Write a protein that binds this ligand. Structure first.
Ligand SMILES: CCCCC/C=C/[C@@H](O)[C@H](COP(=O)(O)OCC[N+](C)(C)C)NC(=O)CCCCC
Ligand SMILES: CCCCC/C=C/[C@@H](O)[C@H](COP(=O)(O)OCC[N+](C)(C)C)NC(=O)CCCCC
Ligand SMILES: CCCCC/C=C/[C@@H](O)[C@H](COP(=O)(O)OCC[N+](C)(C)C)NC(=O)CCCCC
Ligand SMILES: CCCCC/C=C/[C@@H](O)[C@H](COP(=O)(O)OCC[N+](C)(C)C)NC(=O)CCCCC
Ligand SMILES: CCCCC/C=C/[C@@H](O)[C@H](COP(=O)(O)OCC[N+](C)(C)C)NC(=O)CCCCC
Ligand SMILES: CCCCC/C=C/[C@@H](O)[C@H](COP(=O)(O)OCC[N+](C)(C)C)NC(=O)CCCCC
Ligand SMILES: CCCCC/C=C/[C@@H](O)[C@H](COP(=O)(O)OCC[N+](C)(C)C)NC(=O)CCCCC
Ligand SMILES: CCCCC/C=C/[C@@H](O)[C@H](COP(=O)(O)OCC[N+](C)(C)C)NC(=O)CCCCC
Ligand SMILES: CCCCC/C=C/[C@@H](O)[C@H](COP(=O)(O)OCC[N+](C)(C)C)NC(=O)CCCCC
Ligand SMILES: CCCCC/C=C/[C@@H](O)[C@H](COP(=O)(O)OCC[N+](C)(C)C)NC(=O)CCCCC
Ligand SMILES: CCCCC/C=C/[C@@H](O)[C@H](COP(=O)(O)OCC[N+](C)(C)C)NC(=O)CCCCC
Ligand SMILES: CCCCC/C=C/[C@@H](O)[C@H](COP(=O)(O)OCC[N+](C)(C)C)NC(=O)CCCCC
Ligand SMILES: CCCCC/C=C/[C@@H](O)[C@H](COP(=O)(O)OCC[N+](C)(C)C)NC(=O)CCCCC
Ligand SMILES: CCCCC/C=C/[C@@H](O)[C@H](COP(=O)(O)OCC[N+](C)(C)C)NC(=O)CCCCC
Ligand SMILES: CCCCC/C=C/[C@@H](O)[C@H](COP(=O)(O)OCC[N+](C)(C)C)NC(=O)CCCCC
Ligand SMILES: CCCCC/C=C/[C@@H](O)[C@H](COP(=O)(O)OCC[N+](C)(C)C)NC(=O)CCCCC
Ligand SMILES: CCCCC/C=C/[C@@H](O)[C@H](COP(=O)(O)OCC[N+](C)(C)C)NC(=O)CCCCC
Ligand SMILES: CCCCC/C=C/[C@@H](O)[C@H](COP(=O)(O)OCC[N+](C)(C)C)NC(=O)CCCCC
Ligand SMILES: CCCCC/C=C/[C@@H](O)[C@H](COP(=O)(O)OCC[N+](C)(C)C)NC(=O)CCCCC
Ligand SMILES: CCCCC/C=C/[C@@H](O)[C@H](COP(=O)(O)OCC[N+](C)(C)C)NC(=O)CCCCC
Ligand SMILES: CCCCC/C=C/[C@@H](O)[C@H](COP(=O)(O)OCC[N+](C)(C)C)NC(=O)CCCCC
Lengths: 176, 176, 176, 176, 176, 176, 176, 176
């Protein structure tokens, strides 16, 4: 009897929502804290999200001896996407401090990654800047380790990123 | 037997409310903060909502060196509408400061957008003003970036809007 | 078998209460704040509710330079009624300050409205005073806009009312 | 099969308790505040409840320039009764201040009402005193309005009562 | 099929516990506060509960100008009994102050009652003392009224008891 | 069909746990407070529980002019046992202060009881000491009354115990 | 029909988890507090758990006139094991203070026990030391009694352990 | 009838999620606290997790006389993995302080373990360093005992680790 079709639909429907409420609860997020000990003032340009979003303003100014705090997180709902993108600040020397972060949904296939680079001139973050920092500029793993690196322009980085979905990226930018 | 119609209705009813309680939980909202460093006093006229509503008063006065805070949100219930509209303030020079915001329900088809314009004279916001600022005056994306722009009348804007359903729009209006 | 009648009744009963608990949760309410800068003292008369009720006392006195706060809300339970009515204050010049508010249940068919008028003499609010202010005296929409209006008797109004079910009506009464 | 009788009973039983838990949640109550500016001391006699009860002591003394606070509420459980009765205070001039309140269960058939009277001598409240103040002495409606009235004995009343099930009755008793 | 007996038992069992959890929630209790302004010191003897119990110690001493606080409540569980009994204090003049309270379960058949008497000598409370004070010594109703009464021995009472299941009994004992 | 055995088991199982969760919630406990005004120091020996247990240490010392606080409660789980036993303290005169308490599970068949005795020498509490104090030494009822009694050895008791399952036993031991 | 096998499995599965969630909730734990008034400093070696575990560090030092606090508890999950073991501290005289505790799961078959011994030299606790203190060295019962005992080496113990699953063991070690 | 397949699936599905929510609740974690009394400054390199992750930054600096606090935990979700890995700090003498921890999921097959070693030069932790410290360098058990060990380079360790899934590892590093 078609009585069994109605229950099939019922079970089928309870499966569906269990699965959607599950994927809904997977959280991927990133706290970013960058310490400006560069000797110059940074002014915010933008954050290009390749994946996910943010709920806050990107701090506009950041003086010598101050820290910038920003964060983001994957899109709400049962999507299987993470939080991935690039933060671009212009510096008072005319150049751009850029910072990559990647906190993926599917840890089977992907890992956490980060990067820091100083591009020449004012460059807003975008799909190209992300592709460069992610695929072609020796990005660091979110491997629970500290990594130092010279940036040019009389500057060096030193940064840490943990390996979980509740990611934090701490970076210090000092005079090399 | 019509026994299976009664269960079909039952399942059909539980589907319905699951879907309505879902759409009921989608939140779209906007916090707006505008900093008046324009040298003149602004007096509120109104907010035209193309979509959604607000639960608070639109601050009547805003002096030099003060900030205006307003907000809104989509209509209550299981509608698939967002929060979209224009805020109009009259300025003590005889002109209108207008500000667009768009925070749509369906991010598949739409994005966050904002705009700032200075119209000549007292102009209340309405469907026409919205259509202009949205479709025909190079509105900025809610792209997690800062965007500067001269307004005429010895004034410039500089504003930020994030990309999510929990939108904020921060704008500073300064003497160009 | 009459087994299906028992379930029909069951489903039919669960429909009913879902719908009644829903209509039960729809809230319509109004916060009213009127600022007396009229130069005279107001003394309360009454509030005629065309729809809904209040849970508090209508403030008896309101001096020069003070504000009156009152509120109301629709009737409890699964009724489809709103909150609608008129507040009447006598003023020390012998006349009545009257104030309309309308926050309807069914926004398909209706909108928020308000009005402010100065009637000559002591006039308690009632169905007639409401019908006048609502249908025949150019009432303002709850349209998220400020609206000024001279009242006669050396007085002007300037008021705001938002467009939602969680309505507020802010009105300032100053010496014209 | 008598299987359908067992479910009929089941549904029938779930109907019953839904209805009883509903009527159980209807609250009818009254907060009473009377301000003694009569020049004399009041001493409490009693409160005759025609309907409902109270959970507190009726304040025994109330001097010149002090206020009395009392309250009550309908009977607990799924009864369809309200809170209705008369409060009697003896006054130091030898007479009784009496105060009626009525907050009914079924607002289809009834409204809120109140009254204030000064009876000669010591008179405890009771069914007769209630019937007088309710049916035969021009009681005021709980109509969200202020109502003044001379009491004799060099005294006047001025009182307010809202229209809802969460009733309050505020009364001031001053020298006439 | 005996399948319907198993469901009959099931329904029958859910009826039972609904009813037992209901009767379990009926609370009957009594707070007692007696003010000793008798000029003598009272020393506690005991409380005879005709119905119900207490969870606290009966205060042993109570000086001139102090108050005694005690309370009780009906027996835990789905019994249909109330809280009813007599409190006996010996007084420093050699006599006993006795106090009745009755807060019944079934308000259809019974009411709240109280009494105060001064017996000659040391008399512990018991079934006889209760029967006297309840049936044969003009006990006062828990009628939301104050009642004064001379006690002999240069003493008078003046006491109040409300009419609900959440009873309080306030009594003042002063020098007549 | 054995289908009805599976449901019989099911119902039978839901009966069982309802009954076990009920008996699990019955609490029987005792707070004990003994005031040492005996002129000597008491040192704890032990508590023999005939029924139930404790979760705390039996205070080791108790000087002149100090009070001892101990408590216990029935065994965890759906047992139908109470909390019943004897507390033995050695006193600095070479003798034992012993104290009985009984707070039974089944108030149909049993009541609360207590006792105080002074035994000669060091005697730990045990089944015999309990049997003596319970069955053969005129123990006091937990009857919501104070009871005085000479103990010998220049000492008297005066103690109170309420009648409920949430028992407290307050005893004062003073120089006769 | 195999329909009854599916329900048999269902019931069978609900039995299983009810029983596993039950055994999961049985808690067995032990708080240990030992007061060092031995004249020497103790240094921790280890705790051998015959059954269960701990979640904290075993305090390393414990001076003259200080107390050591440690605790443990049975293993998480639906096991039927308790918390049982031996604590070994080295003392500044070259010897070991050892302390047994046993808080079993199944009180049908077992009781609480404790012991205190001073072994010559540094001896870590282990299965042998436990077997000695438990089976062969006259261990004290967790019987809600104080028990004194000379330890040799110019030292005596005096300890208490209650009889419940929420065990505490208080021991004082003083100069004999 | 295929009705029994639909229920089989249903039961089968409820089994599955009960089991997944269970494994989801098993927590394995580690708090690590290391006290630097080595006379030199440590600088963090990294933490290699063989199993699990962390949610925090590995403290970068740790001076003489200060303590480092870090922690981690197994991966979120119904995996049967623990938290296992090695922490590597460079020391101001040019060498690496390394610290192993192992807190496994399946206590049937595995135990808690820890280790401390001083490697020559800067060596980041990794799979090899873990395999050495775990399999080949006499690691200590998480056995609720203190264990001392000379490290070379004028340094010794002394550390404690408990035996449970809520592991802590406390280690002191002092001058040898
Ligand atoms: C049934 C509704 C389930 C809850 C839906 C939440 C959506 O509002 C999110 C919430 O968006 P959020 O505020 O995190 O930021 C998204 C903004 N961007 C589109 C720019 C990334 N937007 C999406 O694009 C996911 C669509 C769900 C597809 C199954
Ligand atoms: C069928 C299983 C294969 C999973 C392929 C995963 C592709 C991901 O790179 C992106 C999302 O990558 P995500 O933003 O989370 O992580 C960042 C990875 N990138 C560094 C490459 C951007 N996945 C999706 O957009 C959803 C695919 C739906 C079918 C399972
Ligand atoms: C079942 C577990 C096996 C894990 C296999 C790992 C594959 C990964 O090497 C890369 C992911 O590399 P990822 O982008 O995290 O890192 C590359 C490093 N850079 C970013 C520096 C280039 N996977 C892909 O590129 C496509 C996977 C989805 C298609 C089925
Ligand atoms: C079904 C949905 C289960 C909820 C998902 C939890 C995941 O987000 C965790 C998130 O892990 P977490 O934030 O602790 O970071 C672990 C990151 N690593 C794997 C790189 C160490 N990662 C996994 O690999 C679990 C796979 C479970 C498959 C049913
Ligand atoms: C069915 C898939 C296509 C969705 C078409 C989207 C229409 C929206 O513009 C408006 C609401 O506009 P919203 O508040 O999202 O965004 C503002 C739209 N603008 C950006 C153009 C102003 N949605 C509706 O009126 C309900 C549509 C039900 C159709 C099945
Ligand atoms: C189902 C029980 C829900 C009713 C609960 C409260 C009622 O007292 C309300 C709420 O009374 P409230 O305290 O808001 O004030 C209403 C008083 N007036 C009628 C005079 C304005 N009054 C009604 O007329 C409910 C109509 C029943 C429709 C099925
Ligand atoms: C097809 C039914 C649409 C609802 C029609 C509403 C008419 C309203 O005037 C009043 C409610 O008036 P409300 O409180 O919304 O606001 C007053 C509106 N006016 C100021 C214009 C009178 N409705 C009722 O009294 C019962 C409606 C029964 C529908 C199940
Ligand atoms: C289908 C969407 C309609 C768009 C909203 C327009 C509403 C108006 O046409 C009036 C609303 O007139 P209202 O009383 O708000 O007056 C508008 C202007 N005044 C307040 C000044 C009179 N509607 C009704 O009276 C219908 C209610 C009968 C339901 C079967
Ligand atoms: C039965 C109705 C339960 C859901 C109704 C919620 C309403 O109170 C909101 C109240 O919205 P809110 O207080 O945010 O203000 C909206 C006011 N305007 C429509 C005038 C802009 N407005 C709607 O238009 C309902 C759409 C129902 C679709 C099934
Ligand atoms: C179908 C007509 C039923 C309503 C008739 C109302 C009678 C009321 O006077 C009193 C309740 O009076 P209440 O305490 O609310 O208010 C006092 C009413 N008076 C002002 C007349 C005294 N009713 C009852 O005690 C049981 C009626 C069961 C109705 C569902
Ligand atoms: C469906 C809406 C129509 C309401 C019609 C109102 C009837 C009421 O005037 C009186 C209410 O009289 P009430 O005593 O509140 O008002 C008179 C005011 N005084 C008490 C001051 C004289 N009802 C009754 O007397 C009997 C009601 C039971 C019928 C089954
Ligand atoms: C199934 C168990 C339901 C909960 C049982 C609570 C009992 O411990 C009460 C709690 O007793 P309580 O601590 O309030 O004081 C009773 C003391 N006296 C017997 C002296 C009155 N005692 C009774 O005598 C009621 C028996 C239930 C008959 C269906
Ligand atoms: C069948 C309905 C008749 C109710 C008869 C009530 C008798 C009560 O006095 C006593 C309890 O009286 P209570 O202690 O609550 O109130 C005090 C009443 N006295 C002043 C007489 C002690 N009831 C019981 O012990 C339970 C009877 C079970 C059959 C329904
Ligand atoms: C359905 C509502 C009708 C109420 C009928 C009231 C009866 C009461 O007068 C007395 C209760 O009188 P009570 O003891 O509260 O007060 C008498 C006053 N003194 C205590 C001063 C004697 N009932 C009884 O004595 C036995 C009732 C149970 C047998 C079926
Ligand atoms: C079914 C169990 C309903 C819960 C019981 C509430 C009663 O304890 C109240 C307790 O009322 P309260 O403590 O407010 O005091 C009212 C006392 N008087 C009736 C003397 C005024 N009294 C009643 O008369 C309700 C009868 C309901 C029959 C289903
Ligand atoms: C079945 C109805 C008769 C209840 C007989 C009571 C026995 C109690 O003395 C003891 C427990 O004694 P308890 O802690 O209540 O009270 C102390 C008893 N004394 C006052 C004699 C010490 N109960 C049990 O051992 C479980 C009985 C299961 C029989 C179906
Ligand atoms: C079903 C999942 C419940 C298991 C949850 C936690 C387990 O880690 C426990 C709790 O571990 P805990 O943190 O208390 O420490 C135990 C460590 N030792 C085994 C070395 C003592 N250890 C077991 O051996 C559970 C036996 C599974 C029986 C079906
Ligand atoms: C008929 C089964 C009764 C339970 C027998 C218990 C034996 C105990 O030695 C240990 C637990 O010892 P425990 O942790 O209670 O305390 C140690 C007791 N001794 C100190 C004597 C070893 N039990 C187990 O290891 C598994 C019992 C499986 C029952 C489903
Ligand atoms: C599966 C067992 C779930 C219920 C077991 C609770 C036990 O932990 C308590 C723990 O009791 P407690 O911590 O209060 O101390 C009692 C210790 N003595 C029995 C030695 C006095 N003691 C019992 O004797 C259980 C009786 C089980 C009857 C089905
Ligand atoms: C029937 C035998 C199954 C248990 C074999 C255990 C393998 C473990 O080394 C690792 C887990 O190692 P874990 O993170 O707990 O601890 C590290 C273990 N080592 C110390 C050897 C590295 N297992 C897995 O990753 C998936 C096994 C699914 C078993 C239900
Ligand atoms: C049912 C209880 C019996 C437990 C028997 C213990 C086996 C363990 O010695 C080792 C655990 O070796 P583990 O690496 O913890 O200990 C050696 C210690 N070191 C790592 C320091 C060398 N197990 C394995 O190597 C494979 C387990 C998977 C079999 C299906």
């Amino acid at each position: 009897v078609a009585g069994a079709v109605i229950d099939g639909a019922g079970l089928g429907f309870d499966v569906l929502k269990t699965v959607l409420e599950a994927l809904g609860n997977v959280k991927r997020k990133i706290a970013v804290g960058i310490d400006n000990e560069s000797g110059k003032t940074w002014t915010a340009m933008n954050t290009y999200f390749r994946s996910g979003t943010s709920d806050i303003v990107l701090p506009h100014k950041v003086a010598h001896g101050k820290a910038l705090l920003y964060n983001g997180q994957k899109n709400r709902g049962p999507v299987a996407t993470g939080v991935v993108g690039v933060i671009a600040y212009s510096m008072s020397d005319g150049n751009t401090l850029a910072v990559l972060f990647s906190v993926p949904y599917d840890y089977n296939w992907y890992s956490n990654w980060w990067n820091v680079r100083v591009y020449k001139g004012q460059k807003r973050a975008d799909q190209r800047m992300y592709e460069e920092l992610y695929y072609h500029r020796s990005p660091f793993r979110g491997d629970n380790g500290w990594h130092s690196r010279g940036l040019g322009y009389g500057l060096k980085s030193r940064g840490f990123m943990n390996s979980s979905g509740h990611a934090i990226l701490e970076i210090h930018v000092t005079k090399a």
